[PDB]
């Protein structure tokens, strides 16, 4: 926009696009597709005018969409110091020093880099570059540090541009050339990092559509391709001769854990695509729905209720209790006929089927050009599958079916409660694992070996019991209370062996991811420590730093905090042990916080994502009136993190201490 507008302004000439046959001419003029808008270019000569900003806004769920942060966490590698010095150090980056390859990528972007980050927060200008045969040598203007291994994250670029524009001379011109060219080259290192050039093709084969539509539209517009191809094999047409009515409803329940840490490392069992599996099991569809029956009052329910069992019997029929539509009656049993394939079940079956195949042909590929084609294909199918539940609810889609949508979340959330219920399972005496109580199957009797007692592979005899769990729509956090040491893993393997294989009925299945260590669940699944140590425990190095990254926006004052880091790190390091640092956690954190607060109530950072108060109890700027907000945030730091400890005594005790 700048370029073309300035051009018009100064010389009155325009940017022109011909057709391939030279019989149409257009001028550049950006337009929009308001959906969080998105700007597009109006060209008609075949070029694809991409823009990464929109693409990573769509396909990635990150906390900041500033070039700095993405270039930060995408391009990174661990480096090793060879000689320290004064006000400058020397790093090397290679093979096994960290994982295969990222050394090479780091060396690639370093070719035009200027400022790096030393393992966190420490920006330094680059002094010397050296492209190794396999890695990189770099020399940085950073102060000397204790350790020998460090993180190396590529970019914050703390530069003051306005000032440089005030005192323009030749030198800063030659500097800013080096900055703008590096920006442009980053805008290509990213496009190679995401492999957009092969997603743009996988999305044109599956999502039958041109190559320049693939990232411009919403889900409702891209599913019609495979859907049409399905309708054409099954000789089917669905016609809605009615005008739909909207009965807004729950989007979903938020699950909230009540402890993190002393729990003694939780497992991390995962669901493999619940909603598509449910839409297959129950055979939900807009045309396998026999009917919904309702009742405005009791004594009509129980009539209808013993009726619809005498007719409509399982397993040929499945019936679901939903949340009442018109706030007035109280029934809404919906009935589905599980005898011929619905349309949505066919769709989902093919999607899961082919993703499961390309998952393999990738494992068998050897060249480096295929391992991109297959990986892009499986990603494509993953997306298309996970986009079908939320689209049944959209009133304006083509998969719209109110009852089917409400019956999802219903079967699903029964499934969730049925898993989390039977999970207590204090295993011992060579295999106890009662789970919760019974291994029944909801929705009907399946006659499938309900024996709460069960014998495992049983490496040895054990006395490890499981604690009631917290779970989610996607995951299940089973917190082992025994806390082996790191071998407890052999316990999750065999647990996967059974729960998602014997305590389960149909296509519902196994995952077993792993997020060990004593996390700190400060909030929804979105905010906690990362501490991730995957199933390869052999000689482990975990990801320690952060999962929340709600530590990026201020919108507040910036004087008297900064401790949030230190409080967080103290609380983390205190739980290295698991038994006896619970009371020590509360005691030390609250005592030290009181001491700090009092010391500088009577005598840089505020991130956690004008009205003035006095401080006489025992356009927003600061003054020498600091004694205001000492009082609030310190109360907060402990009132927020409550889902980690259980010493509910000293918590409100210090709460009362600071009351006066």
């Amino acid at each position: 926009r700048y370029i073309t507008n300035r051009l018009e302004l100064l010389t009155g000439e325009k940017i022109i696009f011909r057709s391939p046959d030279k019989k149409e001419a257009v001028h550049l003029c950006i337009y929009e597709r308001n959906q969080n808008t998105t700007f597009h270019v109006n060209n008609n000569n075949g070029t694809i005018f991409f823009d990464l900003y929109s693409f990573i806004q769509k396909s990635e769920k990150l906390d900041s969409y500033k070039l700095d942060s993405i270039s930060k966490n995408a391009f990174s590698c661990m480096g090793k110091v060879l000689n320290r010095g004064v006000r400058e150090m020397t790093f090397i980056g290679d093979d096994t020093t960290d994982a295969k390859g990222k050394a090479d990528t780091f060396a690639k972007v370093l070719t035009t880099g200027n400022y790096v980050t030393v393992d966190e927060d420490i920006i330094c200008k680059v002094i010397r570059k050296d492209i190794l045969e396999n890695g990189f040598k770099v020399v940085l203007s950073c102060p000397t540090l204790p350790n020998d291994i460090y993180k190396l994250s590529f970019g914050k670029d703390d530069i003051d541009l306005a000032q440089m524009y005030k005192d323009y001379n030749l030198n800063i011109a030659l500097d800013m050339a080096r900055y703008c060219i590096h920006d442009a080259c980053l805008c290509q290192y990213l496009w190679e990092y995401y492999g957009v050039e092969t997603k743009t093709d996988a999305g044109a084969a599956t999502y039958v559509l041109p190559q320049s539509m693939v990232f411009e539209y919403r889900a409702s517009t891209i599913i019609k391709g495979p859907l049409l191809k399905l309708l054409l094999e099954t000789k089917t047409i669905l016609v809605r001769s009615e005008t739909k009515q909207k009965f807004p409803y729950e989007g979903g329940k938020v699950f909230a854990p009540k402890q993190k840490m002393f729990s003694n490392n939780v497992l991390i069992f995962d669901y493999n695509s619940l909603y598509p599996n449910v839409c297959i099991f129950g055979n939900l569809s807009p045309e396998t729905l026999v009917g919904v029956v309702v009742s405005t009052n009791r004594l009509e329910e129980e009539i209808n209720n013993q009726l619809l069992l005498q007719k409509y019997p399982p397993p040929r029929y499945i019936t679901v209790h939903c949340e009442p539509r018109l706030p007035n009656l109280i029934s809404e049993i919906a009935i589905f006929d599980r005898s011929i394939e619905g349309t949505i079940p066919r769709l989902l079956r093919t999607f899961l089927a082919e993703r499961a195949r390309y998952k393999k042909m990738l494992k068998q590929a050897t060249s480096s050009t295929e391992k991109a084609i297959y990986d892009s294909m499986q990603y494509t199918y993953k997306i298309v599958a996970n986009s079908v539940y939320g689209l049944m609810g959209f009133r304006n889609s083509a998969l719209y079916s109110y009852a089917s949508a409400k019956s999802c979340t219903s079967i699903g959330r029964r499934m969730i409660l049925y898993l989390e219920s039977v999970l207590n399972g204090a295993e011992l005496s060579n295999g106890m694992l009662r789970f919760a109580n019974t291994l029944s199957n909801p929705f009907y009797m399946d006659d499938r070996d309900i024996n709460p007692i069960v014998k495992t592979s049983l490496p040895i005899d054990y006395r490890f019991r499981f604690r009631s769990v917290y779970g989610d729509t996607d995951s299940v956090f089973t917190e082992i209370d025994s806390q082996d040491v790191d071998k407890s893993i052999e316990i999750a393997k065999e647990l996967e062996r059974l729960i998602n294989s014997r305590v389960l009925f149909n296509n519902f299945k196994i995952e077993f991811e792993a997020v060990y260590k004593n996390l700190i669940m400060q909030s929804k699944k979105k905010y906690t420590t990362m501490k991730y140590s995957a199933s390869s425990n052999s000689k482990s190095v975990p990801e320690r730093i952060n999962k929340g990254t709600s530590e990026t926006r201020r919108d507040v004052s910036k004087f008297h905090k900064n401790m949030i880091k230190t409080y967080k790190t103290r609380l983390s390091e205190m739980l290295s042990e698991g038994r006896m640092n619970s009371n020590q956690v509360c005691i030390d954190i609250l005592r030290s916080l009181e001491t700090d607060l009092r010391s500088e109530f009577d005598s840089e950072l505020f991130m956690l994502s004008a009205y003035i108060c006095p401080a006489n109890v025992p356009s927003f700027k600061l003054g020498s009136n600091q004694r205001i907000f000492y009082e609030v945030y310190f109360k907060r730091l402990t009132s927020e993190i409550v889902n980690l400890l259980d010493n509910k005594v000293l918590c409100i005790s210090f709460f009362q201490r600071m009351f006066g």
Partner: protein
Amino acid sequence: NKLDINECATVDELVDEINKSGTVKRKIKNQSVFDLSRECLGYPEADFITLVNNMRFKIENCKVVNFNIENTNCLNNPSIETIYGNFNQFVSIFNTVTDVKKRLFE
């Protein structure tokens, strides 16, 4: 009384009188045993529901055999207790109309 017909001392006499009366049959057909057996007793329209929704029941063959109210607050309303005391009559006429509606479109 409610269906503009002759007195019928027994139930099959009733079903006959209905069956020969095409209009009475055809004006039963559209209805529910509940709405009809409450219109034959004049409960107003609604508070009947605040009653019904306060008890549990016992049904077989789509036919009440038992019931019991569990929240007693509603009876403190005047228009409510007049309906409550007058209930067993409604239960009985309900079973009867169930039976005739079964045997008629039988």
